[PDB]
Amino acid sequence: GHNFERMKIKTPTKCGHCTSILIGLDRQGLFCQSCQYACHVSCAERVSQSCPVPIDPTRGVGTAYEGLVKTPRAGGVRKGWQTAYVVVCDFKLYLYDCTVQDVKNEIRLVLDMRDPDFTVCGVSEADVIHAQKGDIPKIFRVTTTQILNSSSSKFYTLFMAETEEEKRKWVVALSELKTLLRRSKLADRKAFLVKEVFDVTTLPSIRVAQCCAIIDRSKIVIGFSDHGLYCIEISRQLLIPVGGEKENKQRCVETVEYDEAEQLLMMIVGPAKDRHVRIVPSAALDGRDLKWIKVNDTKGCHLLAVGTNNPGGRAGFFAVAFKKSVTIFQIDRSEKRHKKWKDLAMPGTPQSIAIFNGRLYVGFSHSFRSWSLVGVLQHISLVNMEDTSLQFLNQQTSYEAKLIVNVPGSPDEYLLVFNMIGLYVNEMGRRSRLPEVMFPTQAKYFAYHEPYLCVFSENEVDIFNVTLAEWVQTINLRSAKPLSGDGILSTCLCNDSPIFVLLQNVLQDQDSIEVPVNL
Template sequence: ASSGISSFLRRHVKVLERPSSQMSYLDQFLKETNSSQQQVQQTHSTRLLYLEGGSIESEEGDIEDNRASIASSKSNLSELSIHEAHSPKHKAHQFLVRTFSTPTKCSHCTSLMVGLMRQGMVCETCGFTCHTACCPHVPSICPVPPDQTKRPLGIDPTRGIGTAYEGYVKVPKQGGVKKGWVRQFVVVCDFKLFLYDISADRNALPSVHVTQVLDMRDPQFNVNTVKDSDVIHANKKDIPCIFKITTSFLEPPGPRNVTLMLADTEGEKNKWVVALSELHRIMKRNNLPSTTVLVARELIDSSLALLRSALSATIIDPDRIVLGTEEGLFCVDLDRSEIARVGEGKKIYQMEYISEEHLLVVVCGKQRHVRLVPIRALDGDDTEWIKVAESKGCSVLTVGPVMKAPLTFFLCVAVKKQQNTTTIMIYEVTRTRSRHNRFKDLQLNVPVHSMQLLSDGRLCVGSPSTFMVYNLHDDSHPFSLIHQENPLYNTLSCSAVDALRVIELPRNEYLLVFATLAAYVDRQGRRSRDREIMYPAVPVALSYRDGHLIVYSETHIDVFYCATGEWVQTLNVKRAKPLNEAGSLSVCILYDYVHLLYLSNIYQRELINLDNIITQDREGRVQKPRRRFSLREGNKSQRLNTDRRSKLISAPTNFNHISHMGPGDGIQNQKLIDLTTNLVDSGEQVVGHHHQQQQRVQKLIPLQLKHGERKRPEISNPTPIKPTFPAYNGAKRSAPPRPRDLPPALPRL
């Protein structure tokens, strides 16, 4: 077994000794697409053509056949095993799951086995490698007959399954073309381009982590040669060898993601351009269903300095969001282009919004206390933040419903103690003055990575390499969601892997999301599916929304459909991180500046009013609004109060103008007004000034109330009144209704 695997690795090293680029099945597939009628009549023969290899003519020369590509992707078959295939007695494959340290292709379908660990299976007898999903379709004869290894049966060009092209290119270093170029290994399969870093050493193998993924299904995908103006910092002799690949980045109007690639020669560049263009044309002609789910829209650009220190955010209503930054909590009115500071300037690490309770839950301050913020504080009220007792040092926070009748929310706070022990304090969110009530405590002897409240009211706690489920309504013993019979149990037990999240699926199935992969289990923790979700790159953060797992890496965002485990989309957004649990609000780095993005689900109702993002000119063309936010300080209701009387200083009484003090005589000739400034209560009415004085200074005084109208009483803490504000584009519209008071108490059963 060891000799088979070692021989496979030796054969895999030959990948780096190949020419800079070569064709796989694409050349013959192009031939079979010349005539659809010919394709129907000769289905079987044409399939053998593109599997046997061939050549495609270009101006610079021939592209090599795919026999070297297939040989490099499969395990080395010894002479002994080949002779054994012709013997009357055939052995069965001995497949075991393996972790590969370099990019490896499946010997059945020739596609890459993407992932960070447990990417595929290897036969210990013959060294045949394949995907876990391809394993049931592999010929049962061990070793596989030579005719089937030369013509793998798993290739499906109509769906892009299989390696169509591969080779070496150079891409710009971080910082642009003027910083130089770095060599990368590129594999084109599954209608995607996978770029792998390679060290300068000739004998070095590519890293198993994908540096960048370019999806051909992207609606903006395009491959072209470059002009001199596109690469002004490039060497003149290199320009004929450079081509560019364009994909979407932000929804219009917005920039496009452009990846420059430098081939060794101009001929190699032409081969790349022809191959990618033809493959993209084939994909479009086959009318494959679109798998796009999310669209990245720029919500706020880099002109807002607060984005540089943004740590969390949540959506309150379609026109208002709340940002948690290192400088404090801020309410952003998108329709009015205003920002207001809320409360003290404490650092906000995490924020959760319970819309049913009109309550914000934040982790703030240097000591990471948990505080409850009533939603009316966003309107400028001097509302006290409710401190949750004994929450100092909160490491993980989660909120969620545990009962539906009546609807009850729980707040779970994990506090790390000494010697890697953790205390989880569980609070019930109430509608009393304190807004919370201590419910239960849990003591754990391990650090806590994550917590989620399940739909049945149980608490799932993620700790190193496992997930434990606790029943909050009784003292039953917790159980693990990774059963000892699960093959993943031994793998995870060897090393401490971060347990990031658990996702509930129908029919009592769970998706356990770890830092290296995601696996499906049943209610007892046994493996429910052979398929596992593989990350192409090391995740830096993740979120879950509308049945999709969103994995953030340094160079892109990957979207997986949890129901099937299918990798459905890649967003080329660099250095992005989510600000909330659903990932609807995220920040990214564009041209070294921080931007706030709204990830919109095209199949769901919009959470943000798109009028705040996209505007149109007179000709109907979409244009980007140039938004400038103004900072709103203090209590807004007092700022808008027309009498401008401070609640801290009493108004003057029995005031009469006696004489003028100061230079100038002109002011003495003016008729000044004696003010009646006594405070009135709610039962009194405002009496106008004398009729003669009103006629003399009608243009000098503000408009008075009509006789019989009630003036707003003076109170120490006025309730803010939402006036109608003009929007940034000049249009007038009423503000959305905002909650002011506590929600009505629900009956307790």
């Protein structure tokens, strides 16, 4: 029988069992080597076991076309077209960079026909004012994600075919697939709608916003690069310096977390040369003069974590990360509202930090470790090196820890999210699911909003249901960047001007914040 091995796929490659491209940045499928068969880890279980072996409209799986097109360089048609490699797969368009002929297995753009606003058509000269006249009949335009409530509103991508005849082929072939998909009546698995909240006229300070957190439906706080922390009462349309104006003069607020049970705001403050942590009672949200409390000996910090799901709802901890150590601080009811609890030496430089369920979690390059904070000292790796299927992590030099998720619905299971993969382990540190979450493109940011992992890249946010280990949505946005720790409040460019968007969970019966209606 086959001798499968986890393989880094170097070029866009169809699964031998289902024909879908093996997307991802690392370990994208299994490869046999005895017979050269390549396939998804999840597909291997149904491949014939005899080794040299002799778009699906329902389930929505399969590669349909693999071709070359031209597409504008980053910046527009005025600067010229460049040859790219397009794959139509799983009712999606995969755009790849290429060089005439070396194609890497990194997608630069995904266009999902499951998008409510997917359309493809030709263009008039007014839609592409800069294309050469003789080129207009060769160009087609694909539309996807609409930004609701916007003040244009839709993500558009232009492709130029080699002939007008090939252009019409492209338009017709993508339309028939969209129509096939619509008729297939596949369940809607999308996670988010995108809603514009503020633009540069309603929030001119948007260009220097660095972070934000939700207080409740009616108000958020936003940290700015030079003006501190402000509380926005959205419906009242009011901008209130947290702790008063004196506290927010020439103050650089880089991150902000809100602890609702304890009524505390916790911040990484400062220009790089005096980065440190400050916390303040959220009574300060109303603009009263109230001095932000300095957390002593947090200079040079690079991460801050406030604990969630504290056991029994106790006040709990926050932790500050340094280059080779972490300090844990206990929240309390004294004047300072906190106290140093414990210094922890770290095996390497923390790359991610979190506290939840009474445990501290720190990620490094190729591991995560946890320290129990209840019953206290006791360090536990989340990867048991007696699991032969996990030993590959020690042999990695390029991995970076991003975040860890306790899987919703699987309390004894964790998703370890690296720059390259998402890996599932149980509480013993052994592998708990054979397939690994793949990301189509190199991520610029990761955020998590239960149960959705949100992976931000240049042209889209890709959404993963952590419970199902399923890629459920592609949200095309231009240079999206999360503002809140959980990403659902983000910024992005709309007609090259910055806007503030909410990623609204379509399963809720009300928006996460009150959205002002844009008319």
